[PDB]
């Protein structure tokens, strides 16, 4: 068992010294088209069932996700207003308390929905909605 050091050193000698996608909300007719929703919330492990949970209540308009991952909204809205609206998801569930890394995920449970942070792991008392 002398090889238990050699290769481990050889690959020890190979380790020596994400951002928000620019959501472009456009409108044609009475709809809302986006560009990179297959890699906007899937950059932070956000389901298509859970990302359209609070937005349906905050816009009061029906809608669903597509097969590619894009999100279609029924209604006319500007670009930088969707974020100012969905702040109650962008700050209430996908942030942390001491790291501010944005690399966080939500949990689904039987009594509350927690904030699993891949920087620290800090949660808060909140009830899913």
């Amino acid at each position: 068992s002398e090889k238990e050091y050699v290769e481990m050193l050889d690959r020890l000698y190979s380790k020596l010294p994400q951002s928000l996608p620019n959501m472009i909300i456009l409108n044609i007719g009475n709809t809302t088209i986006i560009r990179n929703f297959a890699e906007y919330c899937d950059r932070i492990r956000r389901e298509d069932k859970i990302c359209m949970k609070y937005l349906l209540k905050e816009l009061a308009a029906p809608g669903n996700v597509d097969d590619k991952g894009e999100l279609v909204i029924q209604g006319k809205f500007s670009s930088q207003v969707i974020n100012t609206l969905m702040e109650r998801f962008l700050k209430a569930y996908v942030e942390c308390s001491t790291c501010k890394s944005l690399d966080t995920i939500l949990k689904k449970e039987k009594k509350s929905w927690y904030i699993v942070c891949l920087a620290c792991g800090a949660q808060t008392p909140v009830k899913p909605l």
Binding site: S1, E4, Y5, M8, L9, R11, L12, Y13, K15, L16, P17, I105, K107, K108, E109, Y114, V116, L118, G121, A122
Partner: protein, 414 residues
């Protein structure tokens, strides 16, 4: 999403000064074990710390980078959520010599050990012997040896010290303790280190049958400066459970606990209470199972508990019974050399009226001997120790030039 499971295993992180110990526990957990201001301001380990993490393995990816301790697999490039195994924690010891006795406490708690060696100090450093024999007196022969800080030392010098330490393995209880090269800062090869903890250090078979005992290591008054009288929480006593388990609203006693004045002489008072909280890090569990330090707050006043007053005491069920003897007998076999010593002289056998230091589990005492026999002694103590089992692992030292270096291994026959 990943379950919330308390740790089921402890691992002793021991080694000499500047070895990369606290930075190793940072390499595994992401958090450090320097928690009192002096520890930072002096930059050396004075006391034992705590740190926690999980383990998940990506069933698809190759070994070992996928062995990451968070609900993610992205370091191996996979989208899958890894298989969870456990939640793993450590006992971060000091390297200093006036501070050695402390880690002996933790030696009675760990279910494993990762021992570090300095590639960038002359080997074998004196105190390394003392750590090795600490593990050998307590008897946790399960050891993972590591050479550290390899980024300044070349691969040939690393090989030479690897041969030195492969040799350090042969001829003792540790013939096959392995060496997996990592560096504690740059986060190199730590995946293979986690794999090593897993494979070679498994959690023992648990005994949920014996009277649940809690071995105190620390305690605090969480009542912050400015705490008004409406929200007063009890004083937390933290340790690790080894045999049995603890539950919410369990009726216990702290033993020995306080000193009080009794009958014209000195004695101690058994400290009775009801269990009000049991914590594992940042997760709230209603039961405490063995494996990992378990903090229990109760209906006790934290003035009796703040600032590590009761250091090392035991706590048992308020329907239990433990022998409390002011003067205890010991079967002690003497070390062949003084292990942490720069120059290893002989052991000068223990003569009557001498002063000796004991660490029982986590509790510590000074004592003077009253009846000196070759293998058996009866020593008068300044405080009675609680001996929950037969012939418990005490660790014994005599004072050398102001540094209490060990002299043998002892057994209290109750």
């Amino acid at each position: 999403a990943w379950p919330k499971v308390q740790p089921e295993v402890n691992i002793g992180v021991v080694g000499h000064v500047d070895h990369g110990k606290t930075t190793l526990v940072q390499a595994i957990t992401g958090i450090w074990t320097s928690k009192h201001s002096e520890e930072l301001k002096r930059g050396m380990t004075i006391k034992l710390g705590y740190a926690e993490t999980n383990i998940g393995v990506c069933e698809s990816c190759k070994k070992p980078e996928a062995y990451v301790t968070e609900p993610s697999c992205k370091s191996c490039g996979s989208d899958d959520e890894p298989k969870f195994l456990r939640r793993i924690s450590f006992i971060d010891a000091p390297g200093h010599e006036v501070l050695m006795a402390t880690m002996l406490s933790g030696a009675a708690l760990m279910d494993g050990a990762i021992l570090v060696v300095a590639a960038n100090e002359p080997f074998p450093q004196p105190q390394t012997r003392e750590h090795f024999v600490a593990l050998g007196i307590i008897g946790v022969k399960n050891l993972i040896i590591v050479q550290n800080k390899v980024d300044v030392v070349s691969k040939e010098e690393a090989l030479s010290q690897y041969r030195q330490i492969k040799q350090f393995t042969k001829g003792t209880w540790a013939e096959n303790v392995p060496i997996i090269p990592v560096s504690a800062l740059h986060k190199i090869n730590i995946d293979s280190l986690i794999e090593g903890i897993e494979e070679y250090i498994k959690t023992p078979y648990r005994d949920l049958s014996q009277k649940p005992v809690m071995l105190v290591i620390r305690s605090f008054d969480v009542n912050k400066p400015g705490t008004q009288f409406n929200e007063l929480k009890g004083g937390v006593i933290g340790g690790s459970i080894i045999q049995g388990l603890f539950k919410v609203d369990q009726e216990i006693k702290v033993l020995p606990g306080l000193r009080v004045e009794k009958q014209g002489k000195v004695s101690y008072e058994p400290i009775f209470t009801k269990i009000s909280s049991i914590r594992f890090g940042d997760e709230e569990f209603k039961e405490a199972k063995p494996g990992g330090l378990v903090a229990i707050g109760t209906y006790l006043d934290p003035s009796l508990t703040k600032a590590d007053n009761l250091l090392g005491s035991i706590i048992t069920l308020a329907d239990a019974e433990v022998p409390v003897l002011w003067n205890i007998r010991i079967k002690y076999n003497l070390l062949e050399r003084v292990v942490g010593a720069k120059e290893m002289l002989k052991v000068d056998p223990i003569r009557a009226k001498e002063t000796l230091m004991l660490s029982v589990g986590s509790s510590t005492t000074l004592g003077i001997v009253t009846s000196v026999k070759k293998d058996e002694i009866e020593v008068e103590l300044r405080r009675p120790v609680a001996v929950w089992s037969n012939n418990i692992r005490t660790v014994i030292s005599r004072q050398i030039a102001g540094r209490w270096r060990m002299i043998g291994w002892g057994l209290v026959e109750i």
